Amino acid sequence: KVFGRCELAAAMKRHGLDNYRGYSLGNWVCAAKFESNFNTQATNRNTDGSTDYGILQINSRWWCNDGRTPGSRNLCNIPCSALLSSDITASVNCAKKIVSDGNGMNAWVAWRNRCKGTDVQAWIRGCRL
Ligand SMILES: [Cl-]
């Protein structure tokens, strides 16, 4: 599924991401835009052989199992394919564990380079929430 901007904002809000660990809704929408272009089916492979999955591009090296990343962990205890569903529940629940692990949203490279320190409120402007 390819979400619309306001559609994804409303979905994330319903799943408890607004101000989660102090990060306003606009931060999450901005990260999703630049990680996956709002596409739940996005995949990208990394140099070390791990793969990133879904709307928030969660890495198989640490967070999910894809059966082809040797010596990796599965800290969200899910198959990586569950992160590609049109229902974003699994992606959101895993993201909540990632953002709580001490480094906040700096875990997402696109957020650090393209969202951090910008006016992220603009990403939810005009949406009915
Ligand atoms: Cl933080």
Q: Per this entry, what is the length of the chain?
A: 129
The DSSP call for residue 44 is E
- The domain limits of the chain are 1-129
Centre of ligand 1 from the C-alpha of residue 17, in Å: 14
Centre of ligand 1 from the C-alpha of residue 111, in Å: 13
Contact indicator for 58, 83 with CB cutoff of 8 Å: yes
Give the technique used to solve this structure.
electron diffraction
Instruction: Let me know if 35 is a catalytic residue.
Output: yes
Angstrom distance (rounded) from CA 53 to CA 7: 20
Q: Which of 11, 103, 121, 118 is nearest to 55 (CA)?
A: 11
**What's the CATH class of domain 1-129?**
mainly alpha
Q: Which of 17, 30, 42 is nearest to 114 (CA)?
A: 30
Cα radius of gyration rounded to whole Å, the chain: 14
Centre of ligand 1 from the C-alpha of residue 23, in Å: 8
- Integer angstrom CA distances of residue 67 from 44, 45, 80, 86: 16, 14, 9, 22
Q: What is the residue whose two structure tokens read 């990403």?
A: 123
In this structure, the strands spanning 58-59 and 43-45 are unpaired
Angstrom distance (rounded) from CA 39 to CA 1: 6
Angle between the N-to-C axes of helices 5-14 and 25-36, in degrees from 0 to 180, rounded to the nearest 10: 130
Q: What is the resolution of this structure in A?
A: 1.9
